[PDB]
Structure formats: C-alpha cells, structure tokens
C-alpha cells in the first residue's frame, strides 16, 4: 500500500557514532532525529554529539547492554549510569510522548522517573512498548543497525556491563538537506 494517510515523523538532522569494542573499531551508526516532533530533545542530543558546549558524547561508553532489549550510553561525566547532564541543566522535562518505541533501532532518553532527562539515552534492539509514555523517543537508527547488534551481543557481567568497554570513538552532526518521513516501525 502507498500509506498516504499514515502519520509519520520527519528526520530533520542526523548524528553519527563511530563505535569501538575494546580497541577494535566496529563501524558507524547513523541516527535520524525528529527535530519537528521533539526539538528540545533533539537539540540536546545534537549539541552533545558535536561537543559544542564543552562537554559531550565523544569517547563515552555504553555502560549497560541488555541482549534482546537495548544498549544504553551517554554518561560522559561518570561512565556508570550515575552521571551526565543536558545542555539545559542536569535534568529537563519530558518534552512529549508523541513517538513510541516502535521496533528495533529507536532512540530514546534514559531516565530515573518523570522529567529527569539528562544526556543518557538508549537504542532499542526490539520493540520496547512497555517504555511508551515513560521515555521520550527522539530518533531512529537509519544506518549501522548491524553495528548496534555487535554491541547488543557483546559479553556482559551480571550488572549488564560490557566486559570490554564499548565506546563512541567519534561522533558529530550530519545535516539533512530535505527532511524526510520514515515509517513507525
Ligand atoms: Zn589490541
Ligand atoms: Zn523508565
């Protein structure tokens, strides 16, 4: 079907992450970001990817990995899940819950309850509907889902911490010439 009448979010900007497991380069993940739907949340993530406020994601780790669920990172202050901050302060409100965790590859803010978004985020590896309405969804992996799956399946300990550090070796912003809609899947 052409799906003329299905409602869809638009990718307005992209971020790339070049990832490593231990000292091995494993490839690039490119995330499309929904800047018309959740501008405040996207602007935070993009600024943290560029490092332009003097802090950000470069060389931070994915400190919590759960196979058949998600990979979580973004704690660039403590690297353990206790830290991170947004460009608006330590915490900012949930912007909206317009988007859901529709399937593998959706990118969403980690939190410790209502209105506690900072810098930590996760990339789902399955549909995670139980987080809908609780975590703010703001992007989707468009390239490099296979690289996400390498992280997803890395050996972890009983606290879900990778045995070898999984790091964002490089990251930044990629401009999108013309915003484009994607399926809610
Ligand atoms: Zn080596
Ligand atoms: Zn939660």
Numbering used by the authors: -1 to 183
Question: Which sentences did the original study use to describe this structure?
Answer:
CypB is a peptidyl prolyl cis-trans-isomerase (PPIase) found in the endoplasmic reticulum (ER). CypB plays a significant role in the triple helix folding of collagen. It catalyzes the slow cistrans isomerization of multiple proline residues in the collagen chain. Here, we present the crystal structures of recombinantly produced wild-type and HC-mutant CypB from the horse.
A missense mutation in cyclophilin B (CypB) has been identified and pointed to a causal candidate gene for HC. The mutation alters a glycine residue that has been conserved across vertebrates. The HC CypB molecule demonstrates the same overall structure with the exception for the very short N-terminal region that precedes the mutation site (rmsd = 1.31 Å for 8 equivalent Cα positions). The catalytic site remains undisturbed in the HC CypB molecule. Strong electron density is observed for all N-terminal residues of HC CypB. The Gly6->Arg mutation in HC CypB appears to endow greater stability in the N-terminal region, as residues Ala(−1) to Arg6 in the HC mutant structure have higher occupancy values for residues (~0.7 vs. ~0.5 for wild-type) and significantly lower refined B-factors (5–12 Å2 vs. 9–20 Å2 for wild-type). Thus, the Gly6->Arg mutation causes significant change in the structure (up to 4.2 Å shift for the backbone at residue Lys5), with the wild-type side chain density of Lys5 being partially occupied by HC Arg6, and the flexibility of the N-terminal region sharply reduced. In HC CypB, the binding interface is altered: CypB overlaps with the P-domain, when superimposed, such that it could adversely affect binding. The Gly6->Arg mutation in HC CypB has two consequences; first, it adds an additional positive charge to the polybasic stretch, which is involved in the binding of the polyacidic region in calreticulin and thus can enhance the affinity, second, it significantly distorts the geometry and flexibility of the N-terminal tail and thus can slow down, limit or even eliminate binding-competent conformations. Binding of lysyl hydroxylase 1 to HC CypB is fully abolished, which establishes a more important role of the N-terminal tail and a stronger requirement for the N-terminal tail flexibility.
